[PDB]
Symmetry: C3
Subunit: 40 residues, 3 copies
């Protein structure tokens, strides 16, 4: 079931974002691949 | 055009995150596939 | 290293979400492909 994200971080060294979930012990994450770049 | 996200949720049963957008009737979403796991 | 997201936007014309990062000059983004649709 959908749960809220408590903290969203991204990492320019791994090109991933990590969403910490409000669930369980607080250490469940959703993590996905991203592009990372310097925009205008 | 880019619009703000009003609520971000993720679901460990579907392995997707859903971003509710500030747009229209409030029921437009961006939805993407993710990994979901228990981190350190 | 992971840094906080300061602003999350999505765009129904490009089918991408963009996360502005707390890093550098504020113009670093993570950007990823998404589905965009009108949910129930």
């Amino acid at each position: 079931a959908p749960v809220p994200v408590t903290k969203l971080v991204c990492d320019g060294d791994t090109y991933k974002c990590t969403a910490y979930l409000d669930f369980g012990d607080g250490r469940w994450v959703a993590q996905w691949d991203t592009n990372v770049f310097h925009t205008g």
